[model samples]
Target chain A: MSERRDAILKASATAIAQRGIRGLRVNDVAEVAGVSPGLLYYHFKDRIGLLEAALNYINDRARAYRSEGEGGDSARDRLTRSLLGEIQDRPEVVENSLAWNELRASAVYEEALRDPLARTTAAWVSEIADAIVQAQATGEISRSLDPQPTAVTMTALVEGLSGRWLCKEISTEDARSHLLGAIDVVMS
Target chain B: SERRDAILKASATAIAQRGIRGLRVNDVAEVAGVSPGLLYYHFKDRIGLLEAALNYINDRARAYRSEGEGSGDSARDRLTRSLLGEIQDRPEVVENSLAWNELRASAVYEEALRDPLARTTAAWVSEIADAIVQAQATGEISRSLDPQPTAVTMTALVEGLSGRWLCKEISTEDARSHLLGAIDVVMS
Candidate 1:
């Protein structure tokens, strides 16, 4: 959460986006971030450590961005708003989407990546499922709905739509609508 | 037919066992029991081999979908059943889907893969969208549903959930339930 750490993570995400997780070089990240390699090492322990931090950084950045314009009554409404916030045309949101996807791609063979990604995904699904439980409490969604499965579905739904959005297969607008529409699918 | 398919399956298997970064033509050629010249002879290059691997995966799934469908009354029924049928955790299905997603993920860094993946994905989306259009006519799915976008989301959802399942975040049965529930909700 230091300013230097934030800047370093941003560059790390960019490196991961273009080159890949395995391809990330500490000096390259430091140079792009306008910091010294020593400074990067000071902030992050090493390459593996920096990569781990990068994963959390993107997730946290999204979480932070989601909270910025968040406005809704029901837990469902709040959750929907947060989900929709992810696809905005802004630089940070778009950048994070691209970078996170690259991380996911490499996760297939990156053995060390799987556990951290699993943790990130679990935390992510937990927050969504937690909101659904709250949605039920507020009568926004039915009590009959299971939070874990519904949240899990929505997470994958958003991920898939976002992939298409990145590839220009669908416009961001279409991606947004499809995401909102998925809400109806699970709720129904 | 036999030789080309044998090579294609070998590439796909290599991709599943190792990420694209780890894919070696020599290994693939050896596994397929063909010479390296034969691999280049059939597929132009590494990316060509990758694309053909993807083509083979889509083809296998389509074959499976075709056989599994029970001759439903409406194309929506076809669409739903086909999408549900898309979910399988057999060793073959697991390997294919892992290789399938690995290709899409690798497309991020590999520029050559982008268009090829686009074509493959478009084929998938259009096929499902065509079903939605007919289902609309048959009054199976909601008329308000936009076929193209709906198909895109359905396509993404399937890809997304499968990715999660591969990462061990969710069980195959859970993915199946969410996918089935998703289709019913989308149709309603």
Candidate 2:
């Protein structure tokens, strides 16, 4: 990431983290980045642009985290564990989550904006499913079980937990416990 | 069920379709078959009306799933079937779901309601994870893997798909296919 872009992301994270979704703004992000609002605009164009940029940054981290080695588990274990770990531990993950919550809230009325993000959601889900398939193939799971439902359930669980976590209701430990138990059920 | 619950359930469907923010109290009372005064008597106002409704609707749905009636299927089958059946065959369930989305979105801005909803969510994750745990104990699958993460992922996938389905972007059949595929990947 470019230095300016990195600054924007970091600032956005802090802002979103501290203030929640409603508190995020261009001026706040600019102030956090130590750049003028004009410079912020030069980088991102508008408020929506900045939010999308922030979302893009978060997506990059999710990809990076997912790309890292999960190591020596069955294919199912590697994929589900990797996804769970990334979702529970990552800062950008939380931010993106909160942002998505905001977008969902706004989407109740804003059809134009909700459409794209909503579609991207499917893409993200498909990627998670693909990972599960890859992991299952490596004997991370049963040879007979289908991969599709597992992937769907895995994605669903993550999103539900993330929503819980973003609101600070569920602890990391609890999420981990749920992850562990789900694998046992799925593989058996 | 009390008159209060009946009114609340009716209000829930209304709010699900129209959203809690702009929902009309008159319409809620009308659909509920109660007078506005009775609704007001049961719930001090609209916000109270909806919160009570949501708690009832969500908690009820969670309980139904907990019965293990719809949950006796294999990992792939159960998760996909529940989610698909919810969005496609059951419009009331879908309406209640939309109500949940509404309430959740509202919680972001309304601080007082957050904790109640959060607690409800924690209970939800625990319930789902435990169901998986029980299923595992029955020797339906293998013994080594955990089910918690998979449970969370499934929850997220269903939720994500439901939102897409609501907007007409995802078909029920496709949703079932994708969910099944994901489950296969995780279990294999």
- Model 1 Cα shift for residue A95 (angstroms): 1.9
Can you tell me which runs of candidate 2 are displaced by over 4 Å? Answer: A13-23, A36-38, A67-81, A89-93, A104-109, A118-152, A183-188, B1-42, B45-47, B59-85, B89-92, B105-169, B176-188
Residue A23, model 2, lDDT: 71
Candidate 1 residue lDDT tens string, A1-188: 48889889989988877667766888888898888999888777787688888989989988887667566566657787877877889988988888878777667666777788888877778888888988788777878777898788788888877776776666888888888876765554
Model 1's chain B TM-score?
0.89
In candidate 1, which residue ranges exceed 4 Å CA deviation? A34-46, A72-77, A184-188, B21-33, B73-77
B83 in model 1: Cα distance from truth in Å?
1.8
Determine which window of 10 residues in candidate 1 chain B has minimal summed lDDT. B64-73
Range of the 10 consecutive residues with the lowest summed lDDT in candidate 2 chain B: B80-89
Each candidate: what lDDT?
0.79, 0.64
Query: Candidate 1 at residue B71, lDDT?
Result: 50
